[PDB]
Write a protein that binds this DNA or RNA. Sequence first.
RNA 1: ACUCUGGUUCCUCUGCAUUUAACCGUGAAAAUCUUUCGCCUUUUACUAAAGAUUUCCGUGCAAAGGAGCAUACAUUGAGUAAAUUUUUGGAGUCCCCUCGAAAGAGCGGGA
Length: 49
Amino acid sequence: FLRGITPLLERWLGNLLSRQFEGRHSKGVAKTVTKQRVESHFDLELRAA
RNA sequence: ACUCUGGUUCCUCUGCAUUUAACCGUGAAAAUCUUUCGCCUUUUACUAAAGAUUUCCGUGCAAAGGAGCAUACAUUGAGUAAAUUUUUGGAGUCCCCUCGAAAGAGCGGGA
Ligand SMILES: [Mg+2]
């Protein structure tokens, strides 16, 4: 178990630490389109076209 | 006669471990993506199968450098040490006829 959880927590605790020290840069990351958000996204791209 | 090198043990770097039936691992994790099943008023954390990739705990060999211990020159690639029938301890010598200036050559002949 620990063999495989070691790199997973190394990444996760890295991400935890990095936003704890660097702050969270994530403003303007591309939000993806998902179940509820499809129908509003169709209306965006329709009205834009 | 030439150049070629001290044993061991350990550290670390570098390179290679794909023609896999199968196996660097007689052991066995986690993730991502794509798809298909089951949970479910959502997502996460999930179910349990396929396919494709990753990370992680490890493996082998070669080669180079260093560090500790006790100590030995040989030895690798290139290359050393029989008088009794079948070989290396003598069936060897000599003399006529032939062709040819020349010196050999005939299962030639003779002692
Ligand atoms: Mg919502």
